[PDB]
Amino acid sequence: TNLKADPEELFTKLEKIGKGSFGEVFKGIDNRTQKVVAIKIIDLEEAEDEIEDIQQEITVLSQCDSPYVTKYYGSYLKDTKLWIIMEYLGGGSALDLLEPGPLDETQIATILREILKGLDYLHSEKKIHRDIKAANVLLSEHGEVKLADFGVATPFWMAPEVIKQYDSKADIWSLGITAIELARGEPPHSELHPMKVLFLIPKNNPPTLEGNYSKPLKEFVEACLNKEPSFRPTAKELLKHKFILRNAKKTSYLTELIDAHHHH
Ligand SMILES: COc1ccccc1Nc1ncc2cc(-c3ccc(-c4cccc(C)n4)cc3Cl)c(=O)n(C[C@H]3OC[C@H](N)CO3)c2n1
């Protein structure tokens, strides 16, 4: 963390984007390069009890160097405010892109494949994302798909063993929930109170994808959503799943989805 430079001289802060954890996030401009960045500003007086969690997330992001993980550019302390500078992804989140109407299975498979590429990277690095969900999957203006908002080391995407207190297979369960979310718009149990969901996830059989979806997509979901973690496939294995191979296409086609969101 840079304690000498003035981030208000280095960056121009523009409009708020998304909905950041611990602090609001703004579109910003690097005044030296004129590149757009994302800027989170956290008041460290008001967010005192969470400082260790903030530090832990900075450390993890700073150790990641992947096309599939949002890049970390640095942080600055100005008076009581911590500025965190990240890669700007102008397409918004996958969750935002559900708003105009349902995805088709090519779009679902393409987004899942790119998420899987990020999980393959993290798991190979002995890391766990811990909060895979559509709101934490960001798209660039070119359709590139990247992971954001790592979980700290709401229940709807949590694996049963996480709730009951795990390894990288918890991310695979969360991916299965995210696949349902990309197909249906919301995760299982979304109509229920979160305290009820907390006991339902360990108690119940795993969710299935209900509706008129291809059998490969339903089987992709079922494979991720096994109560036994060792029965879930790895991210590497799921990149070869027939649903992915038969349906995923070039990520650049996702710009059509981004444009549809701008037109809605
Ligand atoms: C037009 O663009 C958008 C429109 C709509 C939505 C998103 C964007 N585009 C975007 N592009 C980059 C981001 C980088 C961070 C970001 C992430 C983590 C940290 C960070 C690092 C270390 C420690 C801590 C505590 N935090 C800092 C930042 Cl800067 C960020 O928060 N968002 C907004 C956020 O996206 C995910 C969603 N769940 C809630 O909103 C980001 N949005």
Domain boundaries, the chain: 1-88, 89-264
Q: Are 152 and 177 in contact (CB under 8 A)?
A: no
What is the pairing mode between strands 92-93 and 81-87?
unpaired
Q: What is the 3-state secondary structure (H, E, C) of 193-222?
A: CHHHHHHHHHHCCCCCCCCCCCHHHHHHHH
Q: Pick from 15, 22, 25 the residue to mutate for probing ligand 1's pocket: most ligand atoms within 8 Å of its CB.
A: 25
| Euclidean distance between CA atoms 223 and 7, whole angstroms | 46
Cβ atoms < 10 Å from Cβ of 147: 24
| Euclidean distance between CA atoms 2 and 154, whole angstroms | 33
Cβ atoms < 10 Å from Cβ of 34: 8
* 121 closest CA partner among 220, 22, 236: 236
| CA distance readout (Å), 74 to 51, 59, 87 | 16, 11, 10
198 CB within 6 A, ligand 1: no
17 marked as part of a ligand binding site: yes
Q: Are 168 and 123 in contact (CB under 8 A)?
A: yes
Residues for the chain: how many in total? 264
140 CB within 6 A, ligand 1: no
**43, 131, 171, 259: which is the annotated catalytic residue?**
131
Residues whose CB is less than 8 angstroms from the CB of residue 182 and which lie 6 or more positions away in sequence, other chains included:
94, 98, 103, 107, 108, 111, 112, 134
Residue 157, classed as helix, strand or coil, is coil
| Euclidean distance between CA atoms 65 and 124, whole angstroms | 12
| Euclidean distance between CA atoms 254 and 142, whole angstroms | 8
94 CB within 6 A, ligand 1: no
50, two tokens: 């969470």
| Euclidean distance between CA atoms 84 and 172, whole angstroms | 29
Burial of 191: CB neighbours in 10 Å, binned 0-12, 13-18, 19+: exposed
Residue nearest to atom 12 of ligand 1 (CA): 88
| Euclidean distance between CA atoms 44 and 95, whole angstroms | 29
Strand order in the sheet with 137-139: 92-93, 137-139, 145-147
The residues with which 75 forms a beta bridge, in sequence order, are 84
Q: Pick from 1, 17, 51 the residue to mutate for probing ligand 1's pocket: most ligand atoms within 8 Å of its CB.
A: 17
Q: Are 185 and 158 in contact (CB under 8 A)?
A: no
Strand order in the sheet with 72-78: 11-16, 24-30, 36-43, 81-87, 72-78
| Alpha carbon distance, N-terminus to C-terminus of the chain | 40
148, two tokens: 């954001």
The alpha carbon of residue 128 and the mean position of all alpha carbons in its chain are separated, in whole angstroms, by 12
What is the pairing mode between strands 92-93 and 137-139?
antiparallel
* 107 closest CA partner among 134, 127, 84: 134
The residues with which 83 forms a beta bridge, in sequence order, are 41, 76
139 CB within 6 A, ligand 1: no
Which ligand 1 atom is at minimum distance from the Cα of 40?
Answer: 29
Residue 60, classed as helix, strand or coil, is helix
Residues whose CB is less than 8 angstroms from the CB of residue 164 and which lie 6 or more positions away in sequence, other chains included:
202
Specify the experimental method: X-ray
Q: E strands, 88-175, where?
A: 92-93, 137-139, 145-147
